[PDB]
Amino acid sequence: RFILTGVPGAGKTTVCNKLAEKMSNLSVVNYGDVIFEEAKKLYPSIIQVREDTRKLPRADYRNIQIEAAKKISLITDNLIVDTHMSLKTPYGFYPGLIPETINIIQPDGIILLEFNPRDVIARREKDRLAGKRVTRDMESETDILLHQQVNRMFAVSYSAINQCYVKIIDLTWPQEYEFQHTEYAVNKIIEMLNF
Amino acid sequence: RFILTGVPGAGKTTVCNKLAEKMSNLSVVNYGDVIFEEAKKLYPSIIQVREDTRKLPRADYRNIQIEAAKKISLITDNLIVDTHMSLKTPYGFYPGLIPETINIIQPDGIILLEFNPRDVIARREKDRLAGKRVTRDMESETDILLHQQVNRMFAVSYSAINQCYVKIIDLTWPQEYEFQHTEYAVNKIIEMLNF
């Protein structure tokens, strides 16, 4: 079991689904969908899209994270958990994982897909212009770089606390063709889990 | 409840005072000054300047941190705590926050004012030339960048541990007028407190 993370809009789910393809024993589950479910279950009027959950107070937001972690420890087959290491809120960065949730999921490792902010912006803005996932953030190149290095710091903290590996997958290099990052990362991860 | 910090001599304080002015609902309190006073009240022969507070053994230093944190953990609706995230000691960096003081102060988040070392050196040496706070360390640009990055890493670790926010306010950009930095910061902080 491994947690798989990246900045929003850089191709985290695409990699997850290609993995689910090339493997039969493993599942893929999006922690974000579960969080959305519980969040709208208790605050259906302020929550309308996924990003809205970031505006929630700390106490309620913690409750939602803890509830959402419940439906993943239900999974027993090898699993990859699509989630975030930190979330950009009006108040700053908020940890995607908190001791309760880490001890519930008990991940064997974390995987960080790190991109060049140019590509991330390109993908976010292409989806936005095409009327899809319109609600991601319009961030600067600098803001996205900051988000990524902060993701890294959070990951290392979690690892220091919980005996999990920290794998950094470098996708900063320029791509010859589309989804080259995706295939490369999928190949690296297949190599990892087969041992 | 937010802790407000920055490297020495970048203006952490000045920002706090203008906040206390520009908002009426909030109260601002200088945790660092209280630590200074406690330390030289209890060890008057070792501590004469503020930097002397950094050579204390960790056990005694911790006891003083906790004593000062009790005098300052208020129950106002909004509270900003002026302090440091890390301290340069002869033995390395020492955390400005510890689990005990976090549990006392109950902070919702940490706020890091990040400056460009050029401005920091400017302000430090300007005060030093005018006989103000002469004990401030004479540091290279690289030393100051290191101090800021280590502050960031501390903030992230505590956040992961205590489910708090980490807000990074970038003030490396050029300022048309002196203190432009300050107002920018103040404004964003108010935007945070009002939500």
Next chain:
Amino acid sequence: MRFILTGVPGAGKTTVCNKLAEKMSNLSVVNYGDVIFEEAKKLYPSIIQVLPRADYRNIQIEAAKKISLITDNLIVDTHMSLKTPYGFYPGLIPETINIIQPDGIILLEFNPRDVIARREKDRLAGESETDILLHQQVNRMFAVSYSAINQCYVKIIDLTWPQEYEFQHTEYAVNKIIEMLNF
């Protein structure tokens, strides 16, 4: 006092440890890796010549208790992380820090070029720059995490500068460290 001493591989960590042990009689230097090797050889009479990770952690704990027992100033040569096919794994686990009760961590931070040179030098007589810098930043973050949980010092010793003569880094680091132990 008690300090952990850590840095990227093959860059002169043990040379510094030995010169340290020399220039000071009051100090003790110990290699955590050797201690875990010894413990493993002693608890399982044959499995170990170069294990479940529960047992692995238990022997890490045993070695840490052996090191908890030295009286005087202590410097513990070990690593903040190890590069595995699955990613970086922390050298240290919370219980190890609670056992050793270190006053501080010291990170010897090098320039990847010199690291590569020293490595290949050892190779001829029996990683890229980016890989080495990543490992260094990760070590730094691990150190600050351990400090955040146990309130120990985090010292960064900069040895990225060019050497006037070889082993200058070594005596520089020893000078800084000796200056620390004497306060």
